[PDB]
Design a protein around this ligand. Sequence first.
Ligand SMILES: Nc1nc2c(ncn2[C@@H]2O[C@H](COP(=O)(O)OP(=O)(O)OP(=O)(O)O)[C@@H](O)[C@H]2O)c(=O)[nH]1
Ligand SMILES: Nc1nc2c(ncn2[C@@H]2O[C@H](COP(=O)(O)OP(=O)(O)O)[C@@H](O)[C@H]2O)c(=O)[nH]1
Ligand SMILES: [Mg+2]
Ligand SMILES: [Mg+2]
Lengths: 155, 424, 423
Amino acid sequence: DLGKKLLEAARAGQDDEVRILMANGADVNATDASGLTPLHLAATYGHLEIVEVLLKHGADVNAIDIMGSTPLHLAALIGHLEIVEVLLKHGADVNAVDTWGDTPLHLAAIMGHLEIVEVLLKHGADVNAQDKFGKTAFDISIDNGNEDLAEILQK
Amino acid sequence: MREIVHIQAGQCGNQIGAKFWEVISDEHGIDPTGSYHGDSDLQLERINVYYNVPRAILVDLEPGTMDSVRSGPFGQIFRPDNFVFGQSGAGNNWAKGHYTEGAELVDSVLDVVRKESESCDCLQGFQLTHSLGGGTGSGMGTLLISKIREEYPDRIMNTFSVVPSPKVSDTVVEPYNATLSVHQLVENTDETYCIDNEALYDICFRTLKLTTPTYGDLNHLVSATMSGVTTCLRFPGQLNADLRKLAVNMVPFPRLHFFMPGFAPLTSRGSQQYRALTVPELTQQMFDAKNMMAACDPRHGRYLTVAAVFRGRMSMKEVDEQMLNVQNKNSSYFVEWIPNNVKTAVCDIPPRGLKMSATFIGNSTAIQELFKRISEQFTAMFRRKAFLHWYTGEGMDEMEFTEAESNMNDLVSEYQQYQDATAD
Amino acid sequence: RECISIHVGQAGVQIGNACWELYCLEHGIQPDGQMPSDSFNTFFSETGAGKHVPRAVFVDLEPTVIDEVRTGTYRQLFHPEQLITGKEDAANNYARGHYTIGKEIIDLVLDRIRKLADQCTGLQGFSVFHSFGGGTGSGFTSLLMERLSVDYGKKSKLEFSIYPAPQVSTAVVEPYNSILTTHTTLEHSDCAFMVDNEAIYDICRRNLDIERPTYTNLNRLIGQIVSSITASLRFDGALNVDLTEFQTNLVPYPRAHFPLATYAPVISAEQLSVAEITNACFEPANQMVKCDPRHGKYMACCLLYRGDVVPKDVNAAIATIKTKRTIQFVDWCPTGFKVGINYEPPTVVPGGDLAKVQRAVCMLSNTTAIAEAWARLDHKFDLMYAKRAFVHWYVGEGMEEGEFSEAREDMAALEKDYEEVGV
Ligand SMILES: Nc1nc2c(ncn2[C@@H]2O[C@H](COP(=O)(O)OP(=O)(O)OP(=O)(O)O)[C@@H](O)[C@H]2O)c(=O)[nH]1
Ligand SMILES: Nc1nc2c(ncn2[C@@H]2O[C@H](COP(=O)(O)OP(=O)(O)O)[C@@H](O)[C@H]2O)c(=O)[nH]1
Ligand SMILES: [Mg+2]
Ligand SMILES: [Mg+2]
């Protein structure tokens, strides 16, 4: 199966072995068990060159998995500023919500990726978006005593 | 699958048996002393099948038959040990051959059968020639068959059984004997060539225009048929090569293994055949019921399987065409639910005295006609209970006759079922 | 690096002879094994004395055919331990090949395969040659394939089946044997090239100009087309360089692993263009299995050219056919034709009715129209099994009657699997 090798390649980050697998017609939008496309995996583990290749060969920028995680969710969680900006440029949903009710702004705020918070905000991230418990990104900055994040959320 | 052990039992058994050895000894280029004076490798390619000297065992309760064989032309070639003969004769009593006198001798025969089988690279099976209306050939033969069947269950059993007819002997107990013997063959043999004396007389009388056919005249037709059906077995060839493969492609249902043989052209004893037949002529001796060695009309039934053996130099292209022709131009006579049920094979070495020939082995449901005749004669005799004290005195039970009667009728019904069957 | 060939029944064995005859001419190897001259050692091993031995096992439940191997032109080429024979054949009965007779010799055969696999370092898998209708070819192969999926489970196995044809058919029950092996060998085969003996008959009557072909005629033509498929493995081409790639390129569904092979040109010995021969790959008259690809969808398609070929001529002939014919593909396939070229000329046999051609091509294409061939067998099967005809032979040699139905359902399910892909 070439779709499973592409999932493994995009994860482990073998740029050449992605290009080879795609040269034999591998499924760019192949899902693993939990619905994770190669774009999910490349955007999670910070493989910018593989992200841009998949996007340019027709990868669904807004593909969700079994838990509603878009690639922009995972990039903003792990803190890959380069990939966050590439995803948004290819029309990613800045206010996607996942099964836990979190947006990319929630995850970048929890993990303290202030530079990505600022990028998401400038692409129209919803500061008033709430999670399951009912907490916004601004509520997270207040509850966690994070004045650096509170200031960047009101800029 | 190489060697075949041959057996001949009873008067008829050793008559058509020896005639068979006469025919195929010539064809393979063996003289009566047992030495090769041929001139072709296609002759000794598969001589190991029937020879070592024939792999033949001679059996009869009648001791006279011993000498009628050895005083024959090729009588010198048979191994002296392989002669196994009793003191008295069975006298047309199947029970004497199967239970009393024939049973006493059958061990001695099995000892020789064992001996000949012991020194075989790889046995195929056995080959018994015998008549069914007799006491020895039928009663002891069928008892021999069962006794081999149980001692050699990994092997084929192939019989050349000749059917009695009033046209050849007016003995009225033959319907009893032949019915009892058919009750055995349907359970004990893989394939059986039905040689009908009714049909042998009707061919010698009507087609060959001989006013009084002798045994020799009827035996000529038989020995020529046997060499024809055994052509595949005795010479190199792709199709129907060994006994098991033949039966595999001939017998779709275990009990329905009674072949109606027939061959062409029909010649007299040593007559001159100036004009050699053409391929389409030979092919048109298949449905020609005047060439069937069993007294049955293929038109009155359907072929389940057919094997054709063309002997001589001829066009393999034309034979294929003619056979493919005759099948579809009579498509209603070949069963539809067995596709490619007719199989044709060619051998370049023709039979003795002929430039071309063709033998036509067929599992035709019409054969039920033959078993009808035997049963009606059996029942007519059995309903008046004539001559039963012969059989019962030898240890048989009256019940046996009823079972054999019923079992042959089941065999007739089965043939009638598959005749009326449809593929839809 | 190494590939092992196995030949089962007369069909396998006699086609084997034709292929190893043709392999040794293509590799300049002598009948005695010598060579006055690597990529080709995928198929051959080497003696200390400069002798090149095939990586092959010959199996038959009966001497006659393999006896002619070891008293013939190439008797010296094989080690005698590679040529294995029984005594009682299967008698056109899958049951005897698989159950009754096959169990008596399966262990000796598997043992002699281990001796060739022990000589090999990075063994790829197995090529298997066998008839369908034959008892040995059907029954024993399917057994051997089961046992190879255990003792060598983590590697490839490829079939070269001889699809039956009434014109050379030796048995009535050949539909039975075909269905029975194809059922039990379905899970254990990664890819399988069928050869309709009718197409090979038709081709030899038309293009070789023979009235009544012999087996030598058919086997030679077949060996030419087998050589075309194994050329990539023997000369280190670019396409299909190892046994996995056959599945990668041609098999997008484990079950549906039956490619149609088409070979041009077949020129009598009594030159064409690159474009002309590539058009003949989409002519049904030159297929190895009689069907109509126009009635079916292509899952994949490879072109294996060999000889005087300009890579640009190929791309022209491809664009010609991709534009000027309507080769329908499935939507979930790479719509591009894979290609590879091997500049060595097609070798023929000295004396052969087949002529030396300047260039040649063998198109391997997993079309859904090959389901037509399964339908013809399934139908013949149904007629006979409707009356339970000849079934007692099988049941009386260690086989449960149920296995007939379980096989037929697996063939009915396969006919549905071909349908759903092509709609
Ligand atoms: N193309 C081709 N077909 C063959 C060849 N040999 C046999 N066949 C076909 O294979 C089918 C089965 O015959 P075999 O392969 O000889 O049978 P087997 O494998 O030896 O099995 P058994 O003889 O029953 O033990 C028949 O329909 C033949 O037409 C061959 O050399 N070339
Ligand atoms: N075709 C043929 N039939 C025979 C011959 N001898 C006897 N018969 C038939 O066989 C039956 C008699 O059985 P027979 O073999 O003589 O008795 P057995 O010696 O006890 O087996 C009758 O139907 C005869 O017509 C013969 O030489 N040729
Ligand atoms: Mg007598
Ligand atoms: Mg064989």
